[PDB]
Amino acid sequence: WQLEEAQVFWAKKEQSLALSILKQMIKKLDASCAPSLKLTYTECLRVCGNWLAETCLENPAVIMQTYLEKAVEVAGNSDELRNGKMKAFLSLARFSDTQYQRIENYMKSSEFENKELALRALKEDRKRFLCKAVENYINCLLSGEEHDMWVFRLCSLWLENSGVSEVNGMMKRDGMKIPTYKFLPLMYQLAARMGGGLGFHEVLNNLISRISMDHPHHTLFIILALANANRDEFDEDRTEAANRIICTIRSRRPQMVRSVEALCDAYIILANLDRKGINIPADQPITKLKNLEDVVVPTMEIKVDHTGEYGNLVTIQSFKAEFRLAGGVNLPKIIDCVGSDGKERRQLVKGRDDLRQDAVMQQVFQMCNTLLQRNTETRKRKLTICTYKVVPLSQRSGVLEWCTGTVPIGEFLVNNEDGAHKRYRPNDFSAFQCQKKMMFEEKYEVFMDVCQNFQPVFRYFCMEKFLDPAIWFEKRLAYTRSVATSSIVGYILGLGDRHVQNILINEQSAELVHIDLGVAFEQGKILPTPETVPFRLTRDIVDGMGITGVEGVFRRCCEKTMEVMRNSQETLLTIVEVLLYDPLFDWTMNPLKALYLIDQSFNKVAERVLMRLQEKLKGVEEGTVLSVGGQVNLLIQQAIDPKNLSRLFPGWKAWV
């Protein structure tokens, strides 16, 4: 009963207020301990350690007292047990991870600060207590589902751990701990660095294989791609060998589904797709022209659907030849393939294209959605993020599915021209405002006229398409949330291009998904005349919905959005870090050559991003952290800027 004073950790926001006494009471309970019911109290006594973490005033020794007392609470040691086990082994990780994070700081902040044996012992304080935390994370890993989030931090650790710690190999010997059913989600992050030192890499590769042994049905696509990514039909490549070696682990995979790879190769033959413009028939002939009909086989191209039993799924059963394609610098290839259900995936395809680089974000998104999915507060808003399921199966190329609802909104503006925007302003008048390019304060005036000469019409857009205004009132929430989420992500996301090239919304969904997949977190600053704010067109603002300062809808969520972020505040940085240094980070590169219009320092800049991310999560680069609403309202203010609009560049110059 008394434990409710755990409320009074913040219920009295005062710590210790009961709590220390409660901790004393816990100590008293810990005394009163001298059955498993108490283990719960011990689990409470563990949560006391978490409540001690709620202080987080304990010396790591006082942790080596209290977290040891927690470790003793951890030694308090099956249903709630698992919960406790996680509530320990993870807290056991987490606290020791917290220590290990302190020790990570006291690695890194020390690596900052320190850059002896003591440090090595501090390194051991990592290489034990962290490794212990890691073990406890391994234990956390061992623990079970629902804490699994830190597995990135673990993976991050494992990545940090990588190159050292046959202890991590021991932890990989312990690596049996989790289901790959749990583990799998890192597989991409796995692969990139997956292939050097055997005790890490091959062991990892083995462990990867050991993991990858599970649900190649999920994984082999990565694997296939992980291999296939280098091919061209018409340097740290040990991975490729390891990949070949994995291809042996993949050969260990019995499937001989490599027909699917041939289908990829056919898709790679489709990567040769190249050129009669029209509403597109007649893509059939090549890639083996339905390539054995695409008869039911390893299957489900984009098709991100997953199972813990997986190895049970829906099949390939056909491919629609003569398939479409869209345009582009790479004309997007529209891949019509009929699954077992014969639903024909319309599968987006583009060459010379780094997808996992983007799909990182998708992956980043992927559990971010879970991260989204976590607080029912979101579920209260039921506020999510869209998923473009793709692969860079070729380093040039190899998966997506383009379904519906690409928002050329500017064509819908050409259809806003075809809408009310008759008698408004030339499309190229924007280009004339883009001829206002040469300047700048003049521009700071100039297009306001065009802006005056324009209006934010798109609110009508599918509102018109809507009837039963419920749906409108409903999709309004998408047009709130589905609207919001991205920009809601975006700054936090360290988002990418505002473009039509960003702009899309799923109308059948009646939700708004604009995937640029464009930037690094800060690559928006990597631009020539870089500029940013949170993406929202006045039209989008108008199209947020009719009224209310649309944050004056969104912010309510947008804060609640920022909340989970704040709630996540560090957490994703692990994913982010897990993202940060990997091979696809040619993605993270915020890259060069003006992207068709060191790394540590980048990682420092990434840290600076991570700072900007620390800024992003309940910080601010304005120190404006000023939580979320203030942060948002400021961010809202920040995103509000006509001057930013005035500062805008070519891509969102479209938005102008």
DSSP character string of 492-512: HHT----STTT---BTTTTB-
Alpha helices in 568-627 (DSSP H): 571-580, 599-616
Q: What letter represents residue 539's amino acid?
A: R
The vertex-345 CA angle with 341 and 349, nearest 5°, equals 155
Half-sphere exposure (CA, 13 Å, Cβ side) for 432?
Answer: 12
Residue 337 parent element (H or E): strand 333-338
Q: What letter represents residue 104's amino acid?
A: E
Angle, in degrees to the nearest 10, between helices 201-213 and 187-194: 150
Compute the distance between CA of residue 498 and CA of residue 527 in angstroms, rounded to an integer.
13
Tokens representing 528? 């020539």
Strand partners, 333: 325, 349
Here the contacts of 367-375 (C-beta below 8 Å, separation 24 or greater) are 367/149, 367/185, 367/575, 368/489, 368/572, 368/575, 371/149, 371/564, 371/568, 371/571, 371/572, 372/485, 372/564, 374/564, 374/567, 375/563, 375/564, 375/567
Q: Are 38 and 80 in contact (CB under 8 A)?
A: no
Strand extents, DSSP E, 339-411: 344-349
The helix/strand/coil state of 236 is: coil
Residue 621 parent element (H or E): none
Q: What letter represents residue 626's amino acid?
A: L
Compute the distance between CA of residue 541 and CA of residue 535 in angstroms, rounded to an integer.
10
Give percent helix, percent strand, percent coil of the chain, each to the nearest 5.
Answer: 60, 5, 35
Compute the distance between CA of residue 572 and CA of residue 46 in angstroms, rounded to an integer.
25
Count of beta carbons in the 10 Å neighbourhood of residue 362: 24
Phi, psi of 508 (to 5 degrees): -50, -50
321 contact partners, CB below 8 Å, separation of at least 6: 283, 284, 289, 290, 336
By the 10 Å C-beta count (0-12 exposed, 13-18 middle, 19+ buried), 438 is classed as exposed
Numbers of helices and strands, H then E, in the chain:
31, 2
Rg of the Cα atoms in the chain = 26
| The length of the chain, given as a count of residues | 656
Closest CA to 535 of 407, 355, 627: 407
Tokens representing 513? 């998904």
Compute the distance between CA of residue 629 and CA of residue 435 in angstroms, rounded to an integer.
37
Q: Are 389 and 399 in contact (CB under 8 A)?
A: yes
Compute the distance between CA of residue 43 and CA of residue 81 in angstroms, rounded to an integer.
9
Tokens representing 642? 């006509």
Tokens representing 213? 């042994």
Compute the distance between CA of residue 317 and CA of residue 342 in angstroms, rounded to an integer.
6
The vertex-532 CA angle with 370 and 558, nearest 5°, equals 40
Tokens representing 539? 């039209």
Compute the distance between CA of residue 649 and CA of residue 365 in angstroms, rounded to an integer.
26
Q: What letter represents residue 371's amino acid?
A: L
Compute the distance between CA of residue 337 and CA of residue 225 in angstroms, rounded to an integer.
19
Q: Are 67 and 96 in contact (CB under 8 A)?
A: yes
Solved by what technique? cryo-EM
- Which residue has 């807290």 as its token pair? 91
The helix/strand/coil state of 272 is: coil
Tokens representing 78? 């099956």
What's 320's DSSP letter?
A: B
Q: Are 83 and 46 in contact (CB under 8 A)?
A: no
First to last CA, the chain: 60
Tokens representing 479? 């047009």
Count of beta carbons in the 10 Å neighbourhood of residue 108: 16
What's 146's DSSP letter?
A: T
- Which residue has 């920040």 as its token pair? 638
Compute the distance between CA of residue 385 and CA of residue 490 in angstroms, rounded to an integer.
11
Q: What letter represents residue 114's amino acid?
A: N
Tokens representing 278? 């029209």
User: What's CA 581's distance to the chain center, in Å?
Assistant: 15
Tokens representing 47? 């949560």
615 contact partners, CB below 8 Å, separation of at least 6: 621, 622, 625
Phi, psi of 268 (to 5 degrees): -75, -40
Exposure class string for 185-198: b at 16+ Cβ within 10 A, else e: bbbbbbbbbbbbee
Angle, in degrees to the nearest 10, between helices 216-228 and 258-271: 50
Q: What letter represents residue 423's amino acid?
A: R
By the 10 Å C-beta count (0-12 exposed, 13-18 middle, 19+ buried), 423 is classed as exposed
The helix/strand/coil state of 422 is: coil
Q: Are 400 and 302 in contact (CB under 8 A)?
A: yes
Q: Are 251 and 243 in contact (CB under 8 A)?
A: no
Compute the distance between CA of residue 627 and CA of residue 555 in angstroms, rounded to an integer.
12
Here the contacts of 83-87 (C-beta below 8 Å, separation 24 or greater) are 83/43, 84/39, 84/40, 84/42, 84/43, 84/46, 85/139, 85/142, 85/143, 85/144, 86/140, 86/143, 86/144, 86/146, 86/147, 87/43, 87/46, 87/47
Compute the distance between CA of residue 568 and CA of residue 424 in angstroms, rounded to an integer.
45
Closest CA to 537 of 397, 402, 390, 639: 639
Resolution in A: 5.7
* 244: region left, alpha or beta (phi > 0 left; psi from -120 to 50 alpha): alpha
Whole-Å CA distances, 573 to 154, 488, 539: 12, 17, 32
Compute the distance between CA of residue 631 and CA of residue 624 in angstroms, rounded to an integer.
6
Alpha helices in 497-590 (DSSP H): 538-544, 551-567, 571-580
Count of beta carbons in the 10 Å neighbourhood of residue 561: 26
Count of beta carbons in the 10 Å neighbourhood of residue 307: 12
Tokens representing 68? 């040891």
